[model samples]
Target: QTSQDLFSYQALYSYIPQNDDELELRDGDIVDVMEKCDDGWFVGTSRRTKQFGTFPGNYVKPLYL
Candidate 1:
């Protein structure tokens, strides 16, 4: 049986900036920023499973359209 997914970028973006500490989309919260390459590609890190690559977009299941 497949499990239900929870986290989603669309849902995360719904929250607006409440203060100076408001979460920023480009702040690398949902997406990998530091691991990105000059070619606009992501470089997976050791923190993630080796099978997973830098492009979480490509690996993440149940991705939001």
Candidate 2:
């Protein structure tokens, strides 16, 4: 639940949009706007390479925010 709890409009605003071009947002806006979950949670999509593996062992905690 930590991952779920960590994301918020305020927290997301701290992200620097300059490094990544995949993010779509307006100038002066600190965060990217995207679709929200059914529970009203914010979500962002990105392209990633597929890596197949067994569950449990494949999970890694996010160290960067």
Candidate 3:
């Protein structure tokens, strides 16, 4: 949790949005994390889709590469 705001993440698994506030994820898709929720969810924008929403935090991995 040392990193500052707006970090990058890479989707490790595919995800389907369960609600309008959730962002869909595909394998290897890049996401720009904006907020980290206490409930294991993250608020970010998908680089591949340009969609902004919440997604499961475990579904993605931090990407510094």
Candidate 4:
């Protein structure tokens, strides 16, 4: 990917966490991507709930808004 190690935000168009440290959100939800985990997952904080969570990187998609 062209972007890495850069903290940014993404829309949780479709994201589901793998565990407790992860958070889930409904479609269209958004979060600030804190770090792109090399452990085959994604890390971020939900703006709606103000919480942190991790999920499969593939589970999220590009946001245009």
Candidate 5:
């Protein structure tokens, strides 16, 4: 059960928002990834906007570790 916790700590995720759709991340804006998924999507959230949503994976450069 705790194995999941060990793998949960990914890293300081940083990515550029190349485009916008459901999640309006500016082109040159860098965002912190809150959560991740494999089916071409991620939950982007940060103190910058207090906004969070699952955005299209391709729209961004995808989450990186």
Candidate 6:
């Protein structure tokens, strides 16, 4: 584990990536947010699948605590 704090998000809706650069999101899946883009895409790794890729910011609910 790292010393810095990490933010996480939970998927509210399932999403199948249209492109290879996007991560497949499933309902209730937790993701560790590594980076957020101005274009509204979040780059992170899936907690369940362990795949690192991008996903739409609107599709998930932020877990700030």
* Strongest candidate by lDDT: 3
lDDT of 4 at 60: 55
User: What would the per-residue lDDT of candidate 5 be over residues 1-65, giving only the tens digit for each residue?
Assistant: 21222211122334444454345455444445556788866665433554556554454553334
* CA-RMSD of model 1: 14.1
| Candidate order, lDDT descending | 3, 6, 4, 5, 1, 2
Error of 2 at 54 (Å): 22
For candidate 4, the per-residue lDDT at 16 reads 55
Candidate number that wins on lDDT, 2 or 4 = 4
- Reference-based lDDT, residue 25, model 1: 30
Q: Across residues 1-65, which tens digit of lDDT does each residue of candidate 2 receive?
A: 21333422222222333334334332222222243445433344221211111111111122223
Q: What is the TM-score of each candidate against the true structure?
A: 0.22, 0.21, 0.86, 0.59, 0.45, 0.85
- In candidate 3, how many Å is residue 14 off? 0.6
Task: For candidate 3, write residues 1-65 as lDDT tens digits.
Answer: 22355588999999988998898888999888888899889998888878888989788998884
Q: Model 4, range 1-21, lDDT digits (tens) per residue?
A: 213444545554655555778
Best by TM-score: 3
Candidate 5 lDDT score relative to the true structure: 0.46
Scored by CA lDDT, what does every candidate get? Answer: 0.31, 0.27, 0.85, 0.61, 0.46, 0.81
Q: Which ten residues in a row have the lowest lDDT in candidate 3?
A: 1-10
- In model 2, which runs have C-alpha deviations exceeding 4 angstroms? 1-8, 12-30, 45-65
Query: Which residue pairs in model 3 clash with each other?
Result: none
Clashing pairs for model 6 are none
* 10 residues in a row with least lDDT, candidate 6: 1-10
Which prediction has more favorable lDDT, 1 or 2?
A: 1
List candidate 6 stretches off by more than 4 Å. Answer: 1-4
Q: What is the lDDT of residue 61 in candidate 6?
A: 89
